[PDB]
Design a binder for this molecule. Structure first.
Ligand SMILES: C[C@]12CC[C@H](O)C[C@H]1CC[C@@H]1[C@@H]2C[C@@H](O)[C@]2(C)[C@@H](C3=CC(=O)OC3)CC[C@]12O
Length: 128
């Protein structure tokens, strides 16, 4: 798949609570980044296993759906840059996360080398 197809397939996996499948999309040496992380969190997760250690916990703590996926037109199909919106619900709290993302994804042969995901960490600290 090209980068834009991988992005949309990745969002679909997360919406279904399938964090294992989402991590499976990364290259073994692939990198997840949160350039604007919530206080305390790392900004960079290197390697598929390190990413999985982090993401495996998500499905139990939160449910999410995405909307408004829009891509800017790049030159190379293995790069996608898109904005979208996520609406998460904390399972225990009932608290809600409403986030506008911008993402940069670099792919190589159907696997993710870089998934750079900008969001406003203030939306995380202020559930609704
Ligand atoms: C930073 C974050 C904040 C909510 C909660 O504390 C869990 C952490 C780790 C997990 C993290 C959320 C923020 C969320 O917006 C994420 C970035 C969200 C993602 C959206 C995305 O495309 O991939 C990941 C799913 C869950 C998420 O990966």
């Amino acid at each position: 798949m090209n980068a834009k197809e991988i992005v949309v397939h990745a969002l679909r996996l997360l919406e279904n609570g399938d964090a294992r499948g989402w991590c499976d999309l990364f290259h073994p040496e692939g990198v997840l980044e949160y350039p604007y992380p919530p206080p305390g969190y790392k900004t960079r997760f290197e390697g598929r296993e390190t990413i999985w250690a982090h993401m495996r916990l998500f499905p139990e703590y939160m449910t999410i759906r995405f909307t408004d996926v829009q891509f800017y037109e790049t030159a190379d199909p293995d790069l996608a840059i898109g904005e979208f919106h996520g609406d998460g619900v904390h399972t225990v709290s009932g608290g809600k996360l409403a986030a506008d993302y911008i993402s940069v994804l670099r792919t190589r042969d159907g696997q993710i080398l870089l998934y750079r995901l900008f969001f406003n960490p203030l939306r995380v600290l202020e559930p609704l």
